[PDB]
Amino acid sequence: ITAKPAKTPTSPKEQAIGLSVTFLSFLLPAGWVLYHLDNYKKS
Amino acid sequence: KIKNYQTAPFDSRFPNQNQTRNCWQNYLDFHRCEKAMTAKGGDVSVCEWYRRVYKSLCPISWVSTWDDRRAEGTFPGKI
Amino acid sequence: HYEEGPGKNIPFSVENKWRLLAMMTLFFGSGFAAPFFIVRHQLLKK
Amino acid sequence: ASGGGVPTDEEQATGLEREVMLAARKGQDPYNILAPKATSGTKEDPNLVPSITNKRIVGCICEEDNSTVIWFWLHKGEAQRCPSCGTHYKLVPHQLAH
Amino acid sequence: FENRVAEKQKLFQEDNGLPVHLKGGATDNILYRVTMTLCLGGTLYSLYCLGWASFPHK
Amino acid sequence: ASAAKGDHGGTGARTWRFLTFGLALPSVALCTLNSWLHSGHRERPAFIPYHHLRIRTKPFSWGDGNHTFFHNPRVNPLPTGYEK
Amino acid sequence: HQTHAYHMVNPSPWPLTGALSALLMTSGLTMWFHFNSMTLLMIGLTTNMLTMYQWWRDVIRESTFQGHHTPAVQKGLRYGMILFIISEVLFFTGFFWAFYHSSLAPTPELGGCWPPTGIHPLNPLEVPLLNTSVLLASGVSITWAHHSLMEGDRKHMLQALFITITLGVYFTLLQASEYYEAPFTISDGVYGSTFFVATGFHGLHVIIGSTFLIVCFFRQLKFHFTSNHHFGFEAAAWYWHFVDVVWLFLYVSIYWWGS
Amino acid sequence: MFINRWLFSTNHKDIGTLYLLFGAWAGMVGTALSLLIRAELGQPGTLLGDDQIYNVVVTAHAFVMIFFMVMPIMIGGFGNWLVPLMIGAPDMAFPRMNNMSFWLLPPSFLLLLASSMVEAGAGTGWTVYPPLAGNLAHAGASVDLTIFSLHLAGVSSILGAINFITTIINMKPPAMSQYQTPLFVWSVMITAVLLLLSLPVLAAGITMLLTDRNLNTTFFDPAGGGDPILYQHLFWFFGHPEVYILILPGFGMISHIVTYYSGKKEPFGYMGMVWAMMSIGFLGFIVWAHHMFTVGMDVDTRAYFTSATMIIAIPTGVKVFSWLATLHGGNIKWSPAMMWALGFIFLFTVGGLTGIVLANSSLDIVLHDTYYVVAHFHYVLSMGAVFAIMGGFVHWFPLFSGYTLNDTWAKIHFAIMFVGVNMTFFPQHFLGLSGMPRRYSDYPDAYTMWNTISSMGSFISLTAVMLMVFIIWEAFASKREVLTVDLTTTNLEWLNGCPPPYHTFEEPTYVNLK
Amino acid sequence: MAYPMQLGFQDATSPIMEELLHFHDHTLMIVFLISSLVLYIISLMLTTKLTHTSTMDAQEVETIWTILPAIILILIALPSLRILYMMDEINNPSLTVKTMGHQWYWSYEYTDYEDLSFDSYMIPTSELKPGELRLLEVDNRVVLPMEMTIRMLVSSEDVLHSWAVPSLGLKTDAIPGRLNQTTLMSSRPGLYYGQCSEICGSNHSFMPIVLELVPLKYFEKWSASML
Ligand SMILES: CCCCCCCCCCCCCCCCCC(=O)OCC(COC(=O)CCCCCCCCCCCCCCCCC)OC(=O)CCCCCCCCCCCCCCCCC
Ligand code: HEA
Ligand code: HEA
Ligand SMILES: CCCCC/C=C\C/C=C\C/C=C\C/C=C\CCCC(=O)O[C@H](COC(=O)CCCCCCCCCCCCCCCCC)COP(=O)(O)OCCN
Ligand SMILES: CCCCC/C=C\C/C=C\C/C=C\C/C=C\CCCC(=O)O[C@H](COC(=O)CCCCCCCCCCCCCCCCC)COP(=O)(O)OCCN
Ligand SMILES: CCCCC/C=C\C/C=C\C/C=C\C/C=C\CCCC(=O)O[C@H](COC(=O)CCCCCCCCCCCCCCCCC)COP(=O)(O)OCCN
Ligand SMILES: CCCCCC/C=C\CCCCCCCCCC(=O)O[C@H](COC(=O)CCCCCCCCCCCCCCC)COP(=O)(O)OC[C@@H](O)CO
Ligand SMILES: CCCCCC/C=C\CCCCCCCCCC(=O)O[C@H](COC(=O)CCCCCCCCCCCCCCC)COP(=O)(O)OC[C@@H](O)CO
Ligand SMILES: CCCCCC/C=C\CCCCCCCCCC(=O)O[C@H](COC(=O)CCCCCCCCCCCCCCC)COP(=O)(O)OC[C@@H](O)CO
Ligand SMILES: CCCCCCCCCCOC1O[C@H](CO)[C@@H](O[C@H]2O[C@@H](CO)[C@@H](O)[C@H](O)[C@@H]2O)[C@@H](O)[C@H]1O
Ligand SMILES: CCCCCCCCCCO[C@@H]1OC(CO)[C@@H](O[C@H]2O[C@@H](CO)[C@@H](O)[C@H](O)[C@@H]2O)[C@@H](O)[C@H]1O
Ligand SMILES: C[C@H](CCC(=O)O)[C@H]1CC[C@@H]2[C@H]3[C@H](O)C[C@@H]4C[C@@H](O)CC[C@]4(C)[C@@H]3C[C@@H](O)[C@@]21C
Ligand SMILES: C[C@H](CCC(=O)O)[C@H]1CC[C@H]2[C@@H]3[C@H](O)C[C@@H]4C[C@H](O)CC[C@]4(C)[C@H]3C[C@H](O)[C@]12C
Ligand code: CUA
Ligand SMILES: [Cu+2]
Ligand SMILES: [Mg+2]
Ligand code: NA
Ligand SMILES: [Zn+2]
């Protein structure tokens, strides 16, 4: 497949940001719940 | 007499994994025989085989529930 | 009809990559977070 | 025992249903209900592909019973050949609705 | 009765750009709003019920 | 089978109407005769609290929760027997 | 302009109202079964009726009034109906499986016999036989109606269709009285369970089929059908025959053999 | 206009898109549930300290992955998007009903999430067997909300099946016979037929469970003369066909991907591929009791089911070898999609083979209800379906969006996932052979090592899913528009550009009869 | 029982379980062969610059990959079915014992002569004696005579359960209102473990089975003392 160059190029810096934000959106909420698991079990 | 029973023997009428009817049949047979004997003036000792077989095969709670129902007049089986 | 072409045949906007990141993060993040919160819900009822 | 009172397609069919019906009566197929029969497909006797624009997708079943269909856009102008079997196709554009 | 299909065909083929579900007139609009209001309201109510049932009333 | 009648030279509206009034409806009339004859309320059987009947594992979502949907006092006993 | 004969449908709100009404009915049934309230169920049934009415109204507008049902579109609708009926057959098959499974190997709790001890089945030669002649007769009359329509006879089409509907209603009334008169209930073990759930779903189908016939009756009164194009009528007839055949199996299986 | 387009749609492409979005979202939910499962099993002891919650998690994991992720994506997503394009049809036969098949899913999903919110959830297993699922062992609304979720999902799929079958039979060019349609189209039609016939039996069965729970019927209650085993028969009569329904569209996409990246104009042995899918479909209806080898069935019945089950390997083998024969002599393009397809071929074969081990009732006595079964289906179903979905997704994403993905990132994504899934599931074979039961929140100390490794593998796969989201964002963020696509002569779906216009084939294709 | 890092089946305790080990070895070889062959051929198709993209004929090679698989399936089915029927053979037991599943424990009944019965619960982890197995020990074991054909009847008094003992090759579902039969025969004395094998709710993971196989003479004194 051939394609034209990116109309809005995503630089390495921009990618690190996107990746970081993506990973955090998955990891933070779950991590919070899991961290507080003991606070839930008996309360 | 003609006994010396270890456990209920293989019965060709019930050769599969589901033994529910084997228990049920022997329970019925014993009680039908017990009624015939007690009625016509005879001895329940002839009904012994069925009693041993159903006793060996039937779960205690089943025998117990069935006894309770025969007494209550709610036993669905024909005796 | 409706708009046609790349970035126009979808129910979300891709006009701004950062607003898009936020949308995608909320979309997939909410889905992934749901089971954790339901489990938390069930543990906190008793 | 009998009588009438039930409209006929001739009297009541409308819209596209009516068009397909009237066209079928004149022996025409403006709505592509029938499969066109092939010509010899040579340079001099190409398959005439009707179209209402300046290009139409052609599907060529090179040999009878092939399971693979060769697909390509046939453009207005000089006849084009199937990339697989080389049989000829020529677009004959426009009209349908007068 | 008399055959009035031709009138109905004229009414529904009238070039006003209205989608078929509203092309009959003002009544279509009313019926639609009733249907959709019951659906959306009923849905909100079910969410509320879910919220209620989600917690123990001991 | 072929029935015992005949036609078949051309099954049309007239034929199906002939069957409707000449065979179908008369059959319904006879069965209506037979039925509205053998009816009559049959003496309800003595109640016996059989455990496989009048099942109640959860109360019904109507009335007092102990009556079936089309409960007929005359023939449908409750788990404790017929009603007053 | 399109140059194929198929139907592109205008964006419609019915699929959504239909889906939501499905949520309202299931939610409602839950609220009814567990939280003693029929509010949701009420709204659900209402929006459901509204959705069906408007949706099929639009199909009538698209075909009779706008002419979108070319032979190709009609051909597709035929496949759609046949496939729908097949799925319904498989649905009933599940209940016949349940019936035969229970009846063929009666458990000790029933007295190890069928029908169970304490169950007094209806006489299949009485109302159940009458019900059978009723549905079979309606099968003949609807065939007369179809031939009348195709031969262009309005009066006889309406006459035959009316007779078909009356028979369907007669069946429903008879069945309702049978339900009331029955000495056994749905709670009377697996016998009452299979009897009422199977005949019950069938009864619901008779009501649906009757309604469908009534819709055709009014569309016929308004001259929608031509002697050649009348798919709504054809589908109602196929559906009606399905209902009739399911009854024959129920009658033979549950009423006769299972007695 | 937004509401008109996205809530009142009658377009096959837009509806396909709604399905892909719904399915991707469902996959996230299904994934979180699976990580919760493995977290609990990550080390000896209890994590959640509530095994009813664990059972509810296992149950929901399965329903979500099966009914909300796989089916929506494969049939509703790829099916809606690709089928009309592949046969040159303007849309589906019933474009409005098609929208309802879609909209019934969010309510269905809501009912499922509701069942886990109320009471103590349905900790029954996705099989929902009574009496555990009955009104005494599972009193309350939970199991009923689960049943209703299935009813809506069932109606959606049955109507979708009617739609696909009608579309495929009735809307092909006049000159095209059924033997001139692409293999994906065949796979969808066969899947639709299995759905049409199997879902109504499930519907019947769960309706009987519903009445046993609420209307005092006793279909599965021995007290009223019922039988719990009857439910099993009804469930599995649908259940086996269901597993073939989950893989068939995958087989279809794999045939397209392998053919495409081998630089071939067609798959090897087209008619043999059609025959294989039809045979698998047929046989898939007469083998269900292999899910019941321990319930106490007659030996002859067990011998029959063992035999019938093995026969499925024959048609399945023809497909495997035909894919290999399609690669044979090809100008291999090592695209990310081709990597997914190759991983699919291998992993599917592994899972299929352990399925053959399980077919033997003798061995199944010892393997039934152990992790050996969980390992079997996570290879054929989990890896198989997910890999086919990933391959099809990366392959057709440019067609759907008009943008390209970053191939290097996509290859990295494949690598991580391949490691993750094999690390997660391979050790489960050991756990099964050695006797660890399924549906356990904790295990005897001897099983610690494999359970630890398996849970570690599950995190690797989580990393792959997060990366996948980023990759999709990058594609949409950079906006590299498609220009050219190879092999359009034998891949019609690409012929109208990327993305194709709202209405395609307004003027149908021209195909000579000759 | 299973030991740390175990790869395959627990050591066979009965002749039938031995039979299954051999059958599994036979089948697993076939599985390894076919999976490696497929992996191999994949690598073979992908490692050459040589090409052949024109239409290839199939009605010839399809005979091979249809007949070979069929033969391999028959090679698996034969010994599989032989074992299945062998398990089914009329054996005529010396003893009959019943087990009822419950949420969440098993009860046993030896009612051939005396009316002996008891409950069998998992020993809590906090109450385990040093050297005892977590989640596997029970308060009352199922004492049985070694080297004897025993008939096990399995049922349930509530939801479904499943009585299993991997070492003996046993697994029979416990269904309420049904009486499932299976035969047991241990070639050796000892303690043999198993776990509930059908999800039965909250404590499905915690209702193990422990069989204690001793010589007939000890079984008899144990029965007497257990009345
Ligand atoms: C992750 C944990 C690994 C632990 C390993 C063993 C430690 C042994 C200590 C010490 C070893 C010696 C002492 C103990 C001997 C016990 C013998 C026994 O009782 O015997 C029976 C046992 C043990 O069997 C074995 O004798 C182990 C066989 C292991 C095969 C491994 C293939 C691995 C490939 C890549 C690595 C794994 C992940 C990816 C797997 C990808 C799918 C295979 O149980 C099995 O049956 C397990 C397998 C179930 C069936 C899977 C079938 C298809 C598998 C692979 C096809 C690959 C073809 C191409 C070739 C392979 C290409 C990649
Ligand atoms: C994608 C879904 C999918 C697919 C396609 C399959 C395919 C197969 N499954 Fe599997 N199966 C499941 C999903 C799937 N399964 C699920 C979800 C369960 C558990 C459900 C639950 O309890 O929750 C399950 C459970 C299950 C059981 C029940 C086990 C138990 O509970 O005790 C059995 C029993 O026989 C079985 C067998 C098979 C077989 C023989 C195939 C065959 O179709 C596979 C055929 C493929 C091959 C054999 C490989 C390719 C072939 C060759 C290379 C040719 C040469 C081969 C030979 C000569 C052998 N499966
Ligand atoms: C399609 C089916 C499917 C899928 C994909 C999965 C995926 C996974 N499952 Fe599975 N599982 C089942 C179906 C599936 N499972 C079923 C039916 C059961 C039995 C339930 C019961 O016993 O009742 C079960 C049970 C089950 C158990 C046994 C529970 C027990 O016995 O107690 C375990 C244990 O590890 C497990 C783990 C996992 C893991 C770690 C994953 C995954 O994390 C593996 C990696 C896969 C992914 C991460 C998916 C990625 C997909 C997407 C995100 C979509 C992207 C979308 C687009 C691009 C459009 N599962
Ligand atoms: C409380 C219970 C509820 C009851 C059931 C519920 C619903 C049934 C509903 C409706 C049907 C009843 C009547 C229809 C009414 C009028 C039809 C009008 C047309 C008409 O009169 O039709 C005539 C025949 O109808 C006719 O005898 C009418 C025919 C009537 C037939 C049945 C009567 C049976 C008589 C006894 C015979 C039994 C003997 C059996 C013989 C063996 C059978 C093979 C033919 O005439 P024409 O000159 O060719 O036609 C000119 C255009 N109309
Ligand atoms: C007149 C003949 C026509 C029958 C239908 C007419 C009225 C009843 C209302 C709805 C019925 C629709 C389908 C059938 C569902 C359950 C069986 C009902 C059959 C019936 O009506 O059976 C009655 C029980 O009513 C009961 O519980 C019924 C309780 C009513 C609540 C209905 C429960 C709703 C559950 C529906 C499940 C929906 C799932 C379907 C999914 C479809 C595919 C996805 C029998 O009466 P009884 O007093 O026990 O015995 C009579 C003794 N004199
Ligand atoms: C103990 C159990 C208890 C439960 C039992 C309950 C009920 C019993 C069962 C049935 C009775 C019910 C109703 C019958 C009455 C009418 C049905 C309508 C049939 C009809 O009238 O059909 C017509 C013609 O036949 C046609 O369709 C022919 C074309 C059909 C197309 C649809 C089929 C496609 C689906 C998949 C194809 C199958 C492939 C077969 C090969 C597989 C090999 C294994 C309509 O035309 P059309 O669609 O344009 O086709 C054009 C072909 N001439
Ligand atoms: C159909 C054409 C293909 C032909 C192949 C044959 C396959 C099926 C038809 C055969 C059905 C009748 C067989 C009954 C005879 C045995 C009687 C019996 O007793 O079988 C019973 C169950 O049968 C039952 O419900 C049987 C219930 C039916 C199950 C079959 C499922 C298929 C249905 C779906 C097909 C859709 C068709 C569309 C309809 C037009 C109970 O089981 P047992 O194990 O005995 O339990 C008793 C124990 O106490 C002792 O061990
Ligand atoms: C108390 C009562 C409430 C109970 C709930 C259900 C109530 C009623 C259901 C009855 C169904 C009514 C359907 C009416 C359909 C009218 C539209 C119609 O019939 O539309 C026709 C097409 O068929 C079409 O879509 C065919 C459309 C097929 C619809 C049939 C579907 C049956 C529905 C069953 C739903 C429940 C399933 C079972 C539950 C377990 C229009 O084409 P023609 O007729 O050729 O006209 C064209 C000519 O005029 C040209 O000259
Ligand atoms: C616990 C309770 C669960 C409740 C779940 C209820 C779920 C939904 C309830 C609301 C749904 C009703 C709304 C009416 C739907 C009518 C669909 C219809 O009639 O669809 C037709 C197609 O199916 C055809 O023909 C033939 C097929 C007709 C299908 C009729 C739809 C009935 C829906 C119920 C299905 C149950 C499945 C049965 C097996 C158990 C028309 O296709 P369209 O794309 O519209 O138009 C195409 C145009 O060319 C027409 O001019
Ligand atoms: C798939 C298609 C099927 C979808 C589901 C079918 C829906 C069935 C609806 C049943 O609804 C009803 O429920 C009631 C219970 O709420 C009744 O009222 C009743 O119940 C009471 C409430 O306690 C009493 O006050 C009364 O006497 C009365 O009989 C009643 O008449 C009836 O309309
Ligand atoms: C199965 C998928 C899950 C994958 C594993 C998740 C990977 C780790 C994600 C990080 O998440 C968090 O980290 C914390 C600890 O590092 C938390 O902080 C918490 O801990 C603290 C410090 O110990 C405090 O500062 C705050 O009060 C606090 O709540 C917590 O909120 C959470 O967001
Ligand atoms: C009025 C109409 C004649 C044609 C027309 O509308 O012009 C007649 C012809 C046949 C129809 C009738 C048929 O004879 C069948 C029915 C018989 C009657 O007992 C009641 C009304 C009945 C249901 C019908 C009502 C009537 O208005 C119809 C509809
Ligand atoms: C006859 C039919 C279609 C041929 C065609 O018209 O192109 C072909 C398609 C697939 C073929 C089948 C598959 O190739 C699988 C089998 C292969 C064996 O060599 C013969 C039987 C076998 C079962 C084949 C019989 C027959 O030749 C089939 C069924
Ligand atoms: Cu008892 Cu699991
Ligand atoms: Cu299966
Ligand atoms: Mg099990
Ligand atoms: Na744990
Ligand atoms: Zn050509």
PDB file of N, CA and C in Angstrom, chain F residues 13 16-17 20 32 34-35 38 50 52 54-56 58 61 68 71-72 76, chain G residues 32-33 109 117 125-126 130 140 143-144 151 156 170 180 182-183 187-189:
ATOM      1  N   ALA F  13     -59.917 -20.421  -6.879  1.00  0.00           N
ATOM      2  CA  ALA F  13     -60.703 -19.838  -5.791  1.00  0.00           C
ATOM      3  C   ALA F  13     -62.012 -20.565  -5.550  1.00  0.00           C
ATOM      4  N   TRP F  16     -61.387 -23.841  -3.597  1.00  0.00           N
ATOM      5  CA  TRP F  16     -61.045 -23.642  -2.185  1.00  0.00           C
ATOM      6  C   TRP F  16     -62.201 -23.138  -1.353  1.00  0.00           C
ATOM      7  N   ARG F  17     -63.144 -22.481  -2.008  1.00  0.00           N
ATOM      8  CA  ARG F  17     -64.323 -22.007  -1.333  1.00  0.00           C
ATOM      9  C   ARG F  17     -65.240 -23.229  -1.138  1.00  0.00           C
ATOM     10  N   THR F  20     -63.934 -24.939   1.734  1.00  0.00           N
ATOM     11  CA  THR F  20     -64.182 -24.203   2.975  1.00  0.00           C
ATOM     12  C   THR F  20     -65.586 -24.482   3.516  1.00  0.00           C
ATOM     13  N   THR F  32     -67.997 -28.953  17.022  1.00  0.00           N
ATOM     14  CA  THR F  32     -68.606 -28.021  17.965  1.00  0.00           C
ATOM     15  C   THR F  32     -69.789 -28.730  18.629  1.00  0.00           C
ATOM     16  N   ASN F  34     -70.094 -32.156  18.952  1.00  0.00           N
ATOM     17  CA  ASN F  34     -69.458 -33.143  19.803  1.00  0.00           C
ATOM     18  C   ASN F  34     -68.951 -32.528  21.112  1.00  0.00           C
ATOM     19  N   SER F  35     -68.239 -31.406  21.024  1.00  0.00           N
ATOM     20  CA  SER F  35     -67.693 -30.755  22.211  1.00  0.00           C
ATOM     21  C   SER F  35     -68.730 -30.184  23.146  1.00  0.00           C
ATOM     22  N   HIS F  38     -70.167 -33.316  25.189  1.00  0.00           N
ATOM     23  CA  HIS F  38     -69.352 -34.095  26.135  1.00  0.00           C
ATOM     24  C   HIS F  38     -68.771 -33.237  27.253  1.00  0.00           C
ATOM     25  N   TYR F  50     -49.642 -34.001  46.993  1.00  0.00           N
ATOM     26  CA  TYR F  50     -48.485 -34.552  46.299  1.00  0.00           C
ATOM     27  C   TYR F  50     -47.412 -33.469  46.192  1.00  0.00           C
ATOM     28  N   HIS F  52     -44.915 -33.244  44.033  1.00  0.00           N
ATOM     29  CA  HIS F  52     -44.506 -32.895  42.690  1.00  0.00           C
ATOM     30  C   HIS F  52     -45.494 -31.948  42.007  1.00  0.00           C
ATOM     31  N   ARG F  54     -48.494 -28.458  42.561  1.00  0.00           N
ATOM     32  CA  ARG F  54     -48.682 -27.198  43.286  1.00  0.00           C
ATOM     33  C   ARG F  54     -47.354 -26.659  43.792  1.00  0.00           C
ATOM     34  N   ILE F  55     -46.355 -26.698  42.915  1.00  0.00           N
ATOM     35  CA  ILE F  55     -45.000 -26.245  43.208  1.00  0.00           C
ATOM     36  C   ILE F  55     -44.973 -24.781  43.596  1.00  0.00           C
ATOM     37  N   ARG F  56     -44.188 -24.457  44.623  1.00  0.00           N
ATOM     38  CA  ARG F  56     -44.024 -23.075  45.070  1.00  0.00           C
ATOM     39  C   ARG F  56     -42.576 -22.873  45.528  1.00  0.00           C
ATOM     40  N   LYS F  58     -41.033 -19.876  44.677  1.00  0.00           N
ATOM     41  CA  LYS F  58     -41.003 -18.422  44.766  1.00  0.00           C
ATOM     42  C   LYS F  58     -42.447 -17.982  44.541  1.00  0.00           C
ATOM     43  N   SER F  61     -45.816 -13.276  41.063  1.00  0.00           N
ATOM     44  CA  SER F  61     -45.763 -11.821  41.088  1.00  0.00           C
ATOM     45  C   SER F  61     -47.114 -11.135  40.980  1.00  0.00           C
ATOM     46  N   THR F  68     -52.284 -19.421  40.978  1.00  0.00           N
ATOM     47  CA  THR F  68     -51.801 -19.445  39.595  1.00  0.00           C
ATOM     48  C   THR F  68     -52.545 -18.405  38.765  1.00  0.00           C
ATOM     49  N   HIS F  71     -56.205 -19.270  37.859  1.00  0.00           N
ATOM     50  CA  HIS F  71     -56.712 -20.064  38.976  1.00  0.00           C
ATOM     51  C   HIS F  71     -58.224 -20.233  38.911  1.00  0.00           C
ATOM     52  N   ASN F  72     -58.667 -21.482  38.990  1.00  0.00           N
ATOM     53  CA  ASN F  72     -60.086 -21.806  38.976  1.00  0.00           C
ATOM     54  C   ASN F  72     -60.354 -22.494  40.316  1.00  0.00           C
ATOM     55  N   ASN F  76     -58.814 -26.065  40.794  1.00  0.00           N
ATOM     56  CA  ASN F  76     -57.401 -25.886  41.130  1.00  0.00           C
ATOM     57  C   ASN F  76     -57.168 -25.713  42.625  1.00  0.00           C
TER      58      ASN F  76
ATOM     59  N   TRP G  32     -40.856  -6.350  37.847  1.00  0.00           N
ATOM     60  CA  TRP G  32     -42.102  -7.027  38.165  1.00  0.00           C
ATOM     61  C   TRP G  32     -41.873  -8.296  38.997  1.00  0.00           C
ATOM     62  N   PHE G  33     -40.942  -9.140  38.561  1.00  0.00           N
ATOM     63  CA  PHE G  33     -40.617 -10.392  39.238  1.00  0.00           C
ATOM     64  C   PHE G  33     -39.940 -10.237  40.598  1.00  0.00           C
ATOM     65  N   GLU G 109     -40.142 -39.000  41.213  1.00  0.00           N
ATOM     66  CA  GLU G 109     -40.971 -37.967  41.836  1.00  0.00           C
ATOM     67  C   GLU G 109     -42.364 -37.853  41.221  1.00  0.00           C
ATOM     68  N   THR G 117     -48.520 -39.087  38.488  1.00  0.00           N
ATOM     69  CA  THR G 117     -49.572 -39.448  39.426  1.00  0.00           C
ATOM     70  C   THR G 117     -50.216 -38.139  39.853  1.00  0.00           C
ATOM     71  N   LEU G 125     -60.202 -35.689  22.583  1.00  0.00           N
ATOM     72  CA  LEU G 125     -61.327 -35.826  21.676  1.00  0.00           C
ATOM     73  C   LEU G 125     -62.355 -34.731  21.874  1.00  0.00           C
ATOM     74  N   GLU G 126     -62.183 -33.918  22.912  1.00  0.00           N
ATOM     75  CA  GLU G 126     -63.123 -32.839  23.186  1.00  0.00           C
ATOM     76  C   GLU G 126     -62.672 -31.499  22.602  1.00  0.00           C
ATOM     77  N   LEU G 130     -61.606 -29.994  18.625  1.00  0.00           N
ATOM     78  CA  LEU G 130     -62.344 -28.877  18.068  1.00  0.00           C
ATOM     79  C   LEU G 130     -61.329 -27.831  17.625  1.00  0.00           C
ATOM     80  N   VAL G 140     -57.750 -23.768   5.218  1.00  0.00           N
ATOM     81  CA  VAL G 140     -58.463 -23.892   3.941  1.00  0.00           C
ATOM     82  C   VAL G 140     -58.986 -22.506   3.517  1.00  0.00           C
ATOM     83  N   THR G 143     -56.507 -20.086   2.142  1.00  0.00           N
ATOM     84  CA  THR G 143     -56.067 -20.487   0.820  1.00  0.00           C
ATOM     85  C   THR G 143     -57.099 -19.963  -0.199  1.00  0.00           C
ATOM     86  N   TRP G 144     -58.384 -20.018   0.162  1.00  0.00           N
ATOM     87  CA  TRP G 144     -59.456 -19.499  -0.687  1.00  0.00           C
ATOM     88  C   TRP G 144     -59.245 -17.981  -0.827  1.00  0.00           C
ATOM     89  N   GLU G 151     -57.176 -13.873  -8.263  1.00  0.00           N
ATOM     90  CA  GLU G 151     -58.107 -13.894  -9.378  1.00  0.00           C
ATOM     91  C   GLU G 151     -58.839 -12.566  -9.463  1.00  0.00           C
ATOM     92  N   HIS G 156     -64.842 -11.748  -2.281  1.00  0.00           N
ATOM     93  CA  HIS G 156     -64.540 -13.074  -1.778  1.00  0.00           C
ATOM     94  C   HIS G 156     -63.214 -13.169  -1.034  1.00  0.00           C
ATOM     95  N   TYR G 170     -61.744 -17.745  17.400  1.00  0.00           N
ATOM     96  CA  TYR G 170     -62.493 -18.822  18.014  1.00  0.00           C
ATOM     97  C   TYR G 170     -61.503 -19.746  18.739  1.00  0.00           C
ATOM     98  N   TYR G 180     -58.643 -21.889  31.671  1.00  0.00           N
ATOM     99  CA  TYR G 180     -59.411 -21.677  32.894  1.00  0.00           C
ATOM    100  C   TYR G 180     -59.999 -22.962  33.463  1.00  0.00           C
ATOM    101  N   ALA G 182     -58.954 -26.085  33.020  1.00  0.00           N
ATOM    102  CA  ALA G 182     -57.955 -27.099  33.330  1.00  0.00           C
ATOM    103  C   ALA G 182     -57.732 -27.344  34.826  1.00  0.00           C
ATOM    104  N   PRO G 183     -57.812 -28.615  35.250  1.00  0.00           N
ATOM    105  CA  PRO G 183     -57.610 -28.967  36.657  1.00  0.00           C
ATOM    106  C   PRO G 183     -56.142 -28.890  37.091  1.00  0.00           C
ATOM    107  N   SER G 187     -47.841 -24.671  37.668  1.00  0.00           N
ATOM    108  CA  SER G 187     -47.033 -25.107  38.800  1.00  0.00           C
ATOM    109  C   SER G 187     -47.194 -26.592  39.110  1.00  0.00           C
ATOM    110  N   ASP G 188     -47.943 -27.330  38.288  1.00  0.00           N
ATOM    111  CA  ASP G 188     -48.115 -28.752  38.544  1.00  0.00           C
ATOM    112  C   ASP G 188     -47.037 -29.603  37.923  1.00  0.00           C
ATOM    113  N   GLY G 189     -45.819 -29.383  38.409  1.00  0.00           N
ATOM    114  CA  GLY G 189     -44.677 -30.136  37.941  1.00  0.00           C
ATOM    115  C   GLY G 189     -44.321 -29.914  36.484  1.00  0.00           C
TER     116      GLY G 189
END
